[PDB]
From a paper:
Aurora A is a serine/threonine protein kinase that plays an important role in controlling early stages of mitosis, including centrosome maturation and separation, mitotic entry, and bipolar spindle formation. Localization and enzymatic activity of Aurora A are regulated by its interaction with the spindle assembly factor [name]. We have used fragment-based, structure-guided lead discovery to develop small molecule inhibitors of the Aurora A-[name] protein–protein interaction (PPI). These compounds occupy a hydrophobic pocket on the surface of Aurora A, discrete from its ATP-binding catalytic site, which forms the interaction surface for a linear N-terminal segment of the interacting peptide from [name].
Crucially, we were also able to obtain crystal structures of some of these hits in complex with the Aurora A protein, enabling a structure-based drug design. A representative of such fragment is compound 2, a biphenyl molecule bearing a carboxylic acid and a phenol group on one ring and a lipophilic trifluoromethoxy group on the other. Compound 2 has a KD of 63 μM as measured by our competitive FP assay and a KD of 145 μM as determined by ITC. The binding of 2 to Aurora A, as determined by X-ray crystallography, alongside some key structural motifs showing both the ATP site and [name] peptide binding sites, is highlighted in Figure 2. An overlay of the crystal structures of early hit 2 with CAM2602 bound to Aurora A reveals a remarkable overlap of the core biaryl scaffold in the two compounds.
Numbering used by the authors: 127 to 389
The structure:
Amino acid sequence: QWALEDFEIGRPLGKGKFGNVYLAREKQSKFILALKVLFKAQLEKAGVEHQLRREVEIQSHLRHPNILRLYGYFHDATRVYLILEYAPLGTVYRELQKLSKFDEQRTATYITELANALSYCHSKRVIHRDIKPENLLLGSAGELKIADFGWSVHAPSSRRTTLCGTLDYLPPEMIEGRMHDEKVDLWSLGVLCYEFLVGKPPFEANTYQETYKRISRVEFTFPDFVTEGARDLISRLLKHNPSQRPMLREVLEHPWITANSSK
Ligand SMILES: Nc1ncnc2c1ncn2[C@@H]1O[C@H](COP(=O)(O)OP(=O)(O)O)[C@@H](O)[C@H]1O
Ligand SMILES: O=C(O)c1cc(O)cc(-c2ccc(OC(F)(F)F)cc2)c1
Ligand SMILES: [Mg+2]
Ligand SMILES: [Mg+2]
């Protein structure tokens, strides 16, 4: 049972669609953590309260080295605060802006830590449904951590996520409002793997309608530098039919993954 007075607040860490996440330290400990702030009026006006409940219940009951930790929460008259584990190395979005592209070793390592975290989620029938570079955080030893369980749910489901957000990481069945399962996170894993190596997602366009067309028709091409081992993995993950998508153990055991991942 914490309160705002139990914390010393520092600089902002990142911007959220419902308030910023700030760097903070607990007075009696000097322990460094992140405080996600959400404004009540915005939650109420949007009708996000039920999804915020799912975010807090699901995330707090997960324990994995590649998943961000949710310690607890508290609220006042105008805001809701989420006590998060601090990720010292920032996002994989920022790391991708610095390094225009990632090499095969970085990608295979990140995809390995990502598949390991998703298997733990999928073992509890939990699906993230919002895997994008801004929600992938780098912990103390440079390891990946899955954050923002804002759209996480228990499989199966049909709930609409982005009304007009980034469609780039969403599978065809999600953008079309169809029934979806664990296979949605496998599509996001392929888009992520393509983006890590190329610099941009495979269905990127300057119009929501063109992106919709390109993802529903699976219209993408690989630039010259993409290796046959990466081309195979990406093409296996990015299939229209969710049943034709591989299992997480086949991604972890893929020849191109095992040849470039850091044990
Ligand atoms: N634990 C954390 N450590 C460091 N930065 C974080 C942490 N949690 C969030 N951030 C930063 O805050 C941004 C928004 O946080 P996020 O939880 O994704 O909120 P929203 O769901 O509102 O988008 C992230 O993209 C990242 O830059
Ligand atoms: O008490 C209030 O006035 C209020 C107002 C609001 O808009 C949202 C919430 C709220 C939602 C989820 C939550 O986390 C959960 F309880 F689900 F874990 C904790 C507080 C509380
Ligand atoms: Mg986010
Ligand atoms: Mg969110």
